[PDB]
Design brief:
It is classed as lyase. 3 copies of one chain form a homotrimer. The first copy, chain A, contains 10 helices and 10 strands. Chain A has 257 residues and is of the alpha/beta class. Chain A has 2 domains: 1-199, 2-enoyl-CoA Hydratase, Chain A, domain 1; 200-257, Lyase 2-enoyl-coa Hydratase, Chain  A, domain 2, CATH 1.10.12.10. The first copy, chain A, is globular and about 55 Å long.
C-alpha cells in the first residue's frame, strides 16, 4: 500500500527499494489500447522521481504479459526522442534504475517491444512470442530496432519479422529476446531485483547509463564516458561505504539519490 | 521459363513472386572469375526492377555453393558505395526484397561473403566454409566486415580470419555465418521464401530497410526512422488489406510496388 | 632468453615469432597495483616495436590470471585515447599483431578487462570470473564497455555488472567473455599463436585493423576501409609469396614489417 493506479491500466507498488509495475487489464490480455499506452508511460514517468527506488519489476496480470495492440501523427516527437508508442517501451530504458521484466503467456507485437525496454527478461519456457507487425502490414515501430540490436542476431531478427512467426520462451532465450527461462519468472525477477537493490545505487545507475550509451559511441568516446562516470563515483560517500561494507562482509547502507 | 542467363554464369527464374538465382558454373564449383562477378552483379541489378518479386532464393548449381575466387583499381567506387567485388555480395542486401541463401558443399572466401549478402542462410550440416583470404595474403574485402558484424562475435571472426580454418555447416550456424542447418537447404529456403511472399510486400520491404539501417544509426535516429517507415504503411491500401485478410483468416491480396 | 622484466611485475619472452607475456606477481594473484599497471602498459608498448613478433600470448603466473585491483585524475588522456588503467587492457587491442589470452583461476574486475583486451581467450572450465566493480561502488572503467560489446549480449552484460556475480569459465564461453574452454588454456593459446605466426604478417595485421575499426564505421566506410587495406596487400611481396606457398603446399617465407 498504496497501490498506485494509472488510467485503470497499470498498477505500481513499491517496497524495500523495489517497484513492481503490473500491466493490469487482465481481462483483455493487457492489450494496448489508448489508456494502456497512457498508463504505461505515466507509470514510468512517475518512477523517475520517486526517491529510493533501486530496481523495477515489470510484469502482466492474469494469463499473459501483453497481447499487443488493440484494433479499436507518428513522426512527431512527443516524449523527447520518442512518440507515445515508442515511450511505452523506451521509458524503461530511460529510467535511471534497472528494469527486470517477467514474461508469461502471450507477448506479441507491441507487448514484445514493451518487454524489450527492460534491462533483463525472465520468461516461462512455454510463453508465446512474436514480432507480429508484418501480419497487420506494419513494421515494428515501438523501439524494437533500437532495443533488439544488442541482444538478437541480424539474421534471426529479419526472419522473425518477415514471417511474424510465433516462438516459445525457450527459443526466446536462445534468440536473445529474453535472458532466462524460469517456471516462475516473477519469482526470479523479484529475487534478482532484491539483489540489485542491495548495491550502491549510484554505481548501478552509472552502469546502466554506460550500457545504454556505449553501443552508439566510438571506442574513443566509450573510454571517456567510462572515465567521466567513474569520476563521479570514486571517493564519494556511497563508494567509500561499498568498500567498507565489502571489507566487513556486510550489506552497504547507502544514501539514495 | 524464361531461364534468364547472365554472362553464362548466373541463371534466374521467377515464379509465384519468388526469384530463384542459381550460380551456374558447376563444373568449376561456381568459382569467381571475371564473368561470374559480372553475372552476379547483373542478376541482382535486374531484380531491382522486376515487378512483383517478393523474395529471392540464392543457391549454387552442382556440388558446391562457391569455391571462392579464381586465381586466373580496388578503391574506386563503381557500384554506389561498393566496388564490383563488394557488389557481388552487397547487391543482395541493397535489393528491396529479402534474399534467402541456400548453402551446400564448399563455400570459401568470396563465396562465403556472397552468401553473407543474403538476409538469411540455410546450410547443410556437412558444408565446408572458410574465411579463406589470409591464406592468399589478403583480407576479406567483399563486404564481410559489413555483413558479418551483426551475426558473428568479434572474437570468433578474428580467429577464423587469422587461421583461415575450415568450419562445418553446423559450426556455421552456431557461429552466426548461417541461420539454419538443413539436409536440404534449398527446400528449406524455398519454403521460407514462399511464406515471405504471402506477406504485405511494402511491410516486408520497410522491415528490411530498418534491419539494414538501424545498426549504424543512433537510438534517436532509429526511433525516427521507425516512425517514418510506419507512416508510409499505416492506412495505405496494402496495410488495410493485411488487416482485413488477418481478420477473415485468409491470405492478403496485395498490389506489388 | 632474455626474460624481459618490466617493473618486477610482467615478464616477456619471444621465440619463433611468438611473444609470451606473463603477469608475474603470483604471490598476490597478479593483483593490479601501481607497478602492475606500469608493468603491463610498458610491456605492451615495448612490443609495438619488436621486429618479427607475429602473435602474442598473454597469461598469469601461479594460480590465477588476475585477482583485479589492489585496495592499497581519471579523465586525463595519458595514453592516446586511454588513461593508464584503460591502456592496460587497450594496449593489447592497439598492438598491430593478434593477442591470445589464456585464463585460469580467478579473473575479476580489472583482471577481466585486461584479458578482454586480447583478440581471443582460452579459459579453464572452472575459472572464476566476475564484472566485480559494482561491489566497490564503482563501474567498469578499464575499457570493458568498448571491448565486451562485440562479444557479449546487452542483457547479459547489464545483469553481470549490476549483480557482480561470479561465473565459471564454461559460462564465460557461452556469454562471450571467452572464446574456448580448455583444460590447458596456455597450451591451446600457444598452439593457436603458432598457427597465426605462419601466416602473412601484413594480412594478419590488416585483418586485425578491420576487426578493430569496422564496428564503429558506417557500412559505406567499412567498404572503403576494406578496399584500402586490400590495396596495400594485393601484388605486394608477402602476398605473392602467400599465393606461391599456397600453390606449392608449403609454408610461406615472409618478410616481417
Amino acid at each position: 500500500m498504496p497501490n498506485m493506479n494509472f488510467h485503470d491500466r497499470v498498477s505500481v507498488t513499491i517496497e524495500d527499494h523495489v517497484a513492481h509495475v503490473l500491466l493490469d487489464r487482465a481481462d483483455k490480455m493487457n492489450a494496448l489500447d489508448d489508456a494502456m499506452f497512457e498508463g504505461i508511460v505515466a507509470a514510468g514517468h512517475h518512477l523517475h522521481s520517486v526517491k529510493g527506488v533501486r530496481c523495477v519489476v515489470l510484469s502482466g496480470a492474469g494469463r499473459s504479459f501483453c497481447a499487443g495492440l488493440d484494433l479499436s501523427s507518428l513522426t512527431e516527437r512527443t516524449h523527447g526522442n520518442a512518440n507515445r508508442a515508442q515511450q511505452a517501451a523506451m521509458v524503461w530504458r530511460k529510467l535511471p534504475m534497472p528494469v527486470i521484466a517477467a514474461v508469461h503467456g502471450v507477448c506479441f507485437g507491441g507487448g514484445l517491444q514493451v518487454a524489450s525496454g527492460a534491462d533483463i527478461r525472465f520468461i516461462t519456457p512455454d510463453a508465446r512470442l512474436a514480432v507480429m507487425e508484418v501480419k497487420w502490414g506494419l513494421v515494428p515501430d515501438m523501439a524494437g530496432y533500437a532495443l533488439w540490436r544488442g541482444n538478437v542476431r541480424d539474421d534471426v531478427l529479419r526472419e522473425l519479422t518477415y514471417t511474424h512467426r510465433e516462438f516459445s520462451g525457450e527459443e526466446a532465450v536462445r534468440f536473445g529476446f529474453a535472458t532466462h527461462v524460469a517456471d516462475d519468472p516473477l519469482a526470479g525477477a523479484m529475487e534478482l531485483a532484491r539483489v540489485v537493490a542491495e548495491k550502491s545505487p549510484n554505481a548501478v545507475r552509472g552502469a546502466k547509463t554506460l550500457s545504454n550509451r556505449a553501443p552508439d559511441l566510438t571506442v574513443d568516446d566509450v573510454l571517456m564516458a567510462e572515465s567521466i562516470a567513474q569520476h563521479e563515483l570514486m571517493y564519494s560517500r556511497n563508494q567509500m561505504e561499498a568498500v567498507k561494507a565489502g571489507m566487513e562482509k556486510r550489506a552497504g547502507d547507502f544514501v539514495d539519490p
